[PDB]
Design a protein around this ligand. Structure first.
Ligand SMILES: *[C@@H]1O[C@H](CO)[C@@H](O[C@@H]2O[C@H](CO)[C@@H](O)[C@H](O)[C@H]2NC(C)=O)[C@H](O)[C@H]1NC(C)=O
Ligand SMILES: *[C@@H]1O[C@H](CO)[C@@H](O)[C@H](O)[C@H]1NC(C)=O
Ligand SMILES: *[C@@H]1O[C@H](CO)[C@@H](O)[C@H](O)[C@H]1NC(C)=O
Lengths: 438, 104, 438
């Protein structure tokens, strides 16, 4: 037997799915979602870490001149300064008074801890969904890990289940994101090879192990002070530290729909949105034929107490006449109210009691026990509390039944005015007809 | 001290190093939903203000236009019935007609 | 200086770009593409390989029965048969004539070679692009590997280049592909857990090193023939070999736009489609001052021979008069005809020759030498070779110039008809006016 249904994608909400075919008693399947995961496909662009400046000892030539040649190093800066008189602790370093020359140079290379402290720039793409689903029916209780994409087909107790695809193509990640430690940010980054000093991405590398590097930190050298041996340089501070100081607000404290961001790998969990279609193929061993099922005749429904709240604040009793003790499948055919149990023990006593939850002042819904059906109308008072810690266990609906008190009053007023209008139009019709007969 | 708004969807707050805590709001409001019409109106307004105000004003407008149109139609029917007698020189209106409908 | 342009995505087509700015002589840049790569991002679904049927030695019990319990193995099939009298070469096996019991079992596992030979199922997504571009200008002649993304910024001789993004999002890969050895197939595959015997996907594993396996091959057992010791089984042949036999036509010999498909990684090469935008930033050192560039006056253009063919079948001669010898950049300002040389040498003799290719019967364009411009118009004749072994080196333009023979005849006929119609209209208007006078 093949069946299809749609279930809401909210974690912790029980779902009762009703199955009914000729020649067998109805059945109810309990389906629940324990956790959901939404992972995007990432392709790395570059990584960034802090820098370090390599500046070797200066080369002082006494009574001579020197010239330096360009090298191929990240931000290599060299200069030759003429007319210097270095000093040391003993005395003058060079005999010649003003024929000396100091050669200076420096460059920049990635830090020695770049492998342990770095930020990665990723480009997001289409995202896939994984879920963990608990299925209960009859004597079957199992949790399975499925891919919600319309491809994975799982087998629980000889029953085939296919999930997905999700009904909404929504992801919280923007096109370009940056990942650091345990945080993701929806911040655009400069393109590779075009970084700017002082800000994010001042030094760029294709990967952690790559042997090339792009650096732009505005290294400038200065002429040494007279009577001195040193190398003065000016350079904008590391852009990575500046970014770390005022990165902004993380997506963990801003992601909508209350879903939690985790890294390694990048993923978002419990992202409550949309609904999942479920296609199911059931074997005949899980059903029960009518012959070995109890027969229910003259069953009516009434409500004891109703206070609409997020809990199961509603009790309804069912009266019936049967022929043998047994178990039956009970279900509610409308989403205005949601039941809690799925199987009920029917006995010769002729009375059962069930719990339910609702969110309308006056709910009217049809319940079914085994093959028999009945209707239930109730009036529920609002609760007195204000804040509860648990989530709602009911589908949100507020529209009352047309037989409710407010609907009754509007119907009465409308009927009175309609009768008045009908009388007026009838009077006009008869008057104009007799006038035209003249 | 701070004030945090909690809608029906819920709020999650993080304070220091403890795990974040989530809170949800029930559907509570003043008034009683099974009494005189004003109590029902005030209960619904407490639950959803703008929609209830709009619904009430629309219902009132519809009732008013219907009643006014029907009253005007009845008045016009009376006038059409009674006009041919006034144009007739002399003559008079039967007392049954003048009692059933106000005939000056 | 900042400049922008567009260049066709045809491999081996010499593109010439013109840079003109106040206060400097014009420059001509040569850009060419040597190899383009297009790689889709892939996510694995499963792999398939030939299977093996493992069946152990049968169990024989003399004067005793046995019952076998199920095991969690791929397509495990176990059965017990009663009333057997097995025979060996020595003789009978047990005294009990009809009280023996045989136990048979079999299952299916992956081949010992599946690591070295398997077919992989993949899902295709948005594809990135890689390109290799050669740039020449002045005394700079270099090749560079770039991403046509709008992100990569390359530096060549102090000049910054940025390519992309491509103007046509077209990929020769369907949503689902199957890769084997060095061929890719645009075929759909059965979903995981829903394999059918005898076709592709009879056994599926999530990866090469995984331990779980999903097999469905209809392994049915049968009773042994009397007086025998063996285990008979009927199994549908392996679907992988069946697929190998008549897989179909590979995408290697079917891909449109004439681009070659290679594997490891899955990529396409030389896919001629769309055009690439180019944004460049040049330094002021690459130009030449106007005061040192020669000034051209009284420039006229004549065409000796023309033959619109894929080769450079056309020769034009320019006459001029200068003040100093030098070298100036020559360019064609239209699209109908493309030149071959970028820079030409000007001497006091006042005559230079240029080669060009075209595809229109009557091409008319503007040729700019150094700083002056002239108009070239000529008439060509078709070639005689039906088939050539090299690609066309001209942009395909066929519409003739308005000064050509055919358009000249059309204009003459149209002008005659229009003049005669105008005369008729004037005669009629004169007649109606003189009639209205009376
Ligand atoms: C030796 O052979 C005898 C007879 O061939 C076996 O006795 C049989 O045992 C089975 C089960 O134990 C009974 O169902 C039969 O009825 C027995 N046969 C007779 C004639 O009594 C005996 O089990 C064999 N023992 C060994 C060790 O081979
Ligand atoms: C189903 O199994 C889970 C896991 O053991 C258990 O916590 C739960 O109570 C079971 N449900 C029922 C109805 O027994
Ligand atoms: C540019 O360099 C390549 C590399 O050898 C060479 O093949 C090509 O002819 C050069 N082009 C010019 C115009 O010199």
């Amino acid at each position: 037997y093949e069946h299809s249904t749609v279930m809401p994608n909210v974690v912790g909400f029980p779902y009762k799915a009703h199955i009914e075919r000729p020649g067998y008693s109805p059945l109810t399947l309990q389906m629940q979602v324990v956790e959901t995961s939404l992972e995007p496909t990432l392709n790395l662009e570059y990584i960034t870490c802090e820098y370090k400046t390599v500046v070797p000892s200066p080369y002082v030539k006494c009574c001579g001149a020197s010239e330096c040649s360009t090298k191929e190093k990240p931000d290599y800066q060299c200069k030759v300064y003429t007319g210097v008189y270095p000093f040391m602790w003993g005395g003058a370093y060079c005999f010649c008074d003003s024929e000396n020359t100091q050669l200076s140079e420096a460059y920049v290379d990635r830090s020695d801890v770049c492998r342990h402290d770095h930020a990665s720039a990723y480009k997001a793409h289409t995202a896939s969904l994984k879920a963990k689903v608990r299925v209960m029916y009859g004597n079957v209780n199992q949790t399975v890990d499925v891919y919600v994409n319309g491809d994975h087909a799982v087998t629980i107790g000889g029953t085939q289940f296919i999930f997905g695809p999700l009904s909404s193509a929504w992801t919280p990640f923007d096109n370009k994101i940056v990942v650091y430690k345990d945080e993701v940010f929806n911040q655009d980054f400069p393109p590779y090879g075009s970084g700017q000093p002082g800000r994010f991405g001042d030094i760029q590398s294709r990967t952690v192990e790559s042997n090339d590097l792009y650096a732009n930190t505005a290294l400038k050298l200065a002429r040494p002070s007279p009577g001195m041996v040193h190398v003065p340089y000016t350079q904008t501070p590391s852009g990575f530290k500046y970014w770390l100081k005022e990165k902004g607000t993380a997506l963990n404290t801003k992601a909508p729909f209350g879903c939690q961001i985790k890294t390694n790998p990048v993923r978002a969990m419990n992202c409550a949105v949309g609904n999942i279609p479920v296609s199911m193929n059931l074997p005949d061993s899980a059903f029960t034929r009518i012959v070995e099922a109890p027969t229910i005749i003259d069953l009516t429904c009434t409500v004891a107490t109703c206070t609409h709240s997020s809990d199961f604040g509603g009790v309804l009793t069912l009266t019936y006449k049967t022929d043998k003790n047994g178990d039956c499948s009970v279900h509610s055919h409308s989403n205005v109210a949601t039941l809690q149990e799925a199987t009920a023990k029917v006995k010769t006593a002729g009375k059962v009691t069930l719990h339910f939850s609702t969110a309308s002042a006056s709910p009217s819904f049809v319940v079914s026990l085994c093959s028999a059906r009945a209707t239930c109308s109730a009036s529920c008072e609002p609760p007195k509390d204000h804040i509860v810690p648990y989530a709602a266990s009911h589908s949100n609906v507020v529209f009352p039944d047309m037989s409710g008190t407010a609907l009754s009053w509007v119907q009465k007023i409308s009927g009175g005015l309609g009768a008045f209008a009908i009388g007026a139009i009838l009077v006009l019709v008869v008057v104009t007809c007799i006038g035209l007969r003249r | 001290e701070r004030t945090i708004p909690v809608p029906v969807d819920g709020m999650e707050y993080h304070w220091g190093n403890n795990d974040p805590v989530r809170l949800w709001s029930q559907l509570t409001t003043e008034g009683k939903p099974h009494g005189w019409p004003h109590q029902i109106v005030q209960y619904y307004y407490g639950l959803y203000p703008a929609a209830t105000v709009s619904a009430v004003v629309g219902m009132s407008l519809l009732a008013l236009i219907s009643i006014f149109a029907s009253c005007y139609m009845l008045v016009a029917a009376r006038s059409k019935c009674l006009t041919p007698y006034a144009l007739t020189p002399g003559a008079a209106v039967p007392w049954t007609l003048g009692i059933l409908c106000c005939a000056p």
